[PDB]
Structures are given as C-alpha cells and as structure tokens.
C-alpha cells in the first residue's frame, strides 16, 4: 500500500498547526513508516501538496 | 525497598509514567527515557498538549535561577531549570524533592498522537545538561528514599501498558535465568555487541563495527536503530530467509488475516555475559519486528542510524530488562507478558563460546 484514500471530511482544529485539513476522497502518501507514532501519521496530500498529520482511523489502503 | 509503578501506552507512542508534581500536585504524564538523564515537563501551554506545569501556582517549586537547551535525535527544548516535589500516586507514599526543567520554547518536540507532556531521564549524571553536577531524578531517588541502585523494565505492548520497578527486581516480572550484560561506559545504557544472527545464518563484520559510536539500550526509541554500515547486510540476510517495505517508504499487507510471521526468519542479538569467556544471546521473532499498523498492513521494524545502535522499545517488549547501576551491568530475562494470546515473542538462550570471536568490541 503506497496510498490512503479519505473516509471522512475532516476539518483541522485551529489550535492543532501540523494538522491536515480534508475532504472525503483525498489521496495521502505517508512520509516515513519509520516515524510513525500513534493513531497521527505524517503524510502529504496529493490534492494541496502539503505535509501534515492526518487521523489513521479516517482513512483507508488504495 | 522498591516502588512498583504501573506505565501506560505502548512501543509506538512510548512508555509513559503518571506524576503529580508541586503544591498543590498537577498531575502529568512522563516518558520513561533511558536515553537521556534530564526531567523536563512543559511549562507553558502548547500544541499537541492537554496539559502543562505551572510554577506559578506550585508554592514548593524553587528557581535555580538559570535555563538549559537539549537537542534530541528529531526534537529539540529550551527550559527554565529549578526544583520540586514529585509524588507518584500508587507508588511510595512520600513525595522528594528533585530537578526539573520547565520547557518555554520548543521545535518538533511535542509531536501529534503523543499522550505525554513530560520526558524521564532515567540514563547516568554525565549526559545530564548543562553539567554532571545537576542530579538526575533517579539519583536524588536514591539518596532521600534510600533504595537500592537498580531499576527494572516491563514492556507489555503485544499489538496492556507497562510495569516501572524503581529500587530493584519483581521476579514475578519475569520467567527463568536473568542473563547479565556489563555496562562499557557509564554515559547512557552501552552494553557490547559481539555477532548478531538472522534465522541461524550469520552476518559478517568486524564486532568493533557493532559498537559503532555506542550499543546502547533506549526505552524512549521505538524501533531497534542500527548503524549505516550494519544495516545494508541485515536487509540482504532478512530478503533472503524472506516495495518499498525495507526503506520504511512502504508497507506489505497479508490478505485474509495469515500472519507473516511464519515467512520472517528470527534475529538474534550476542552480548558478552559478565564472565568474559563466556556469552548469552537475545533472539526476537517477527512478531516484535514486522509491527501491524491500523486484511492488516505490516511494517518493517528496523530503521538505520547515522550515530548510534540503539535496542528500542520494540526489542524490550519481549524481555524484562533490569538497570542493575550499583554493579555496572544490564539484565535481560524471558516476560510472562511477552506473549501474543499464549505464543513467545522473544527468546532467551546461553551461555555460549567466545573463543574464535575478538577480545574486545568497544572500539
């Protein structure tokens, strides 16, 4: 598994700056499996191009 | 006397302690690191963080009257330096008074997911910032409670928590022959690596190589690091017992819930036994080092390191490690808690020849 697909549409919470704000659909490449920890994961959105924490449970294996 | 303190959460995430500091007490969760010998805790309110300790409000906490900058493998902190008490709750029933460093600014050190707020330096004075002269919590531990030297580690993250022995053993903690490692350099926890197998088959490398810069023992680490130079061969000997799964850039999941554990060989790490001519060996099964995320997804369990070989929190959860710091020396014994519903993750075994192997590994 390369990619993740959305779920769910998740706005970001003001106060929570390295996390990613998306829509139902979008497509993630996770960074590194090296560093990951917990249920947050460091991946990069192939619809805005940007890198930031996404929720695990929100999004599923392409 | 020794105080037996439940830990929460897992490899992943870390082992975190509860710890209710100052007065009136706040209470905050704390990562036991073994690789570090400061206590820091965040002191004014930050992303990522539920809660933070307020000096303020505390009325026991003393400014030492400076601040202390340290720099971390990926994370770094500058906090005021000063001292309190600490009483952890179903632990001793008496409260001491030891060094804490309140964190003001930071980068890339309170990261998403992470439950803890506070880190534990449980490693030796001398890495201890700014000097060694600042004591570290265990060493101010020692010296009011008056506790043996010594404490112990249970990892228990299969997929409860954990168990944190401050003043000695438990042996219902563990099943067997506790198997002694000395401590090379009393810095951080470096113990000698002599040969490292993988599935009965043995890689070639000078020991020194090993011991890179230092082979030491981290609880603060999640997977198990090993150097630049080593970790090219594992990969060749793992793939041939055996995408981009080996460069942490991918995952590799097994459909309709068969595990690949049966497919993965067994690593096997050697360390010299306190008797010289003589040694034990550590071995892990995939289990502890092909790690299930989120029919599952696998990763793979080993990361390469610029400096260091480190024995992370992946590698601890299979053996009950004791820090015996009155007798230079590391433990290591087989956990009843090291089990996936009835199976062994880990395997403990010796002693074994160091005849044909060289004198010494600590370049």
């Known amino acids: 598994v390369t990619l993740f697909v959305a779920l769910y549409d ?53 | 006397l020794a105080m037996v303190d439940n830990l929460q959460g897992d490899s992943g995430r870390g082992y975190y302690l509860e ?10 969760q704390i990562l036991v690191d073994t690789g570090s010998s400061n206590f820091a805790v965040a002191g004014t309110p930050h992303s990522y963080i539920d809660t933070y300790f307020d000096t303020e409000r505390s009325s026991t906490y003393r400014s030492k009257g400076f601040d202390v900058t340290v720099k971390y493998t990926q994370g770094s902190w500058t906090g005021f330096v000063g001292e309190d008490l600490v009483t952890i709750p179903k632990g001793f029933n008496t409260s001491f008074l030891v060094n804490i460093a309140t964190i003001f600014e930071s980068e890339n050190f309170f990261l998403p997911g992470i439950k803890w707020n506070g880190i534990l ?11 060694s002269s600042l004591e570290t919590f ?21 997929g409860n928590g954990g168990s944190l022995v401050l003043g000695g053993i438990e042996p219902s903690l563990y099943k067997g022959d506790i198997w002694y490692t000395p401590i090379k350099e009393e810095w951080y926890y470096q113990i000698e690596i002599l040969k490292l197998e993988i599935g009965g088959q043995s890689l070639n490398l000078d020991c020194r190589e090993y011991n890179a810069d230092k082979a030491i023992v981290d609880s603060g ?11 090219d061969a594992v990969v060749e000997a793992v793939a041939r017992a055996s995408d ?32 010289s001519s003589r040694s034990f060996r550590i071995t892990i099964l995939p289990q502890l080092y092909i790690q299930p995320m989120m029919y599952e997804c696998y990763r793979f369990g080993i990361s390469p390191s610029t400096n260091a070989l480190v024995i992370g929190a992946t590698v601890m959860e299979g053996f009950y490690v004791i820090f015996d ?15 996936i519903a009835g199976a062994a993750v880990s395997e403990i075994s010796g002693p074994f020849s160091t005849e044909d192997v060289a004198s010494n590994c600590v370049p």
């Open chain 1, 10 to 62: 998740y706005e970001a919470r003001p106060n929570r700056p390295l996390d990613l704000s998306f829509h139902k659909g979008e497509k993630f490449q996770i960074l590194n499996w090296w560093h990951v920890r917990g249920d947050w994961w460091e991946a990069r959105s192939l619809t805005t191009g940007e890198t930031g924490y996404i929720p695990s449970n929100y999004v599923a294996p392409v």
């Open chain 2, 19 to 28: 710890m209710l500091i100052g007065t009136p007490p706040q209470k905050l």
């Open chain 2, 121 to 131: 330096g449980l490693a030796y004075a001398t890495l201890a910032k700014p000097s």
């Open chain 2, 138 to 158: 265990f060493d101010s531990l020692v010296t009011q409670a008056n506790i043996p030297n010594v404490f112990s580690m249970q990892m228990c993250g299969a």
């Open chain 2, 221 to 231: 680490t999640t997977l198990l690091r090993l150097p630049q130079k080593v970790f």
């Open chain 2, 244 to 275: 981009g799964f080996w460069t942490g850039s991918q995952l590799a999941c097994w459909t309709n819930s068969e595990t690949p554990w049966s497919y993965f060989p067994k690593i096997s790490i050697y360390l010299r036994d306190e008797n």
């Open chain 2, 325 to 339: 710091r009155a007798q230079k020396r590391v433990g290591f014994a087989a956990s009843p808690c090291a089990e």
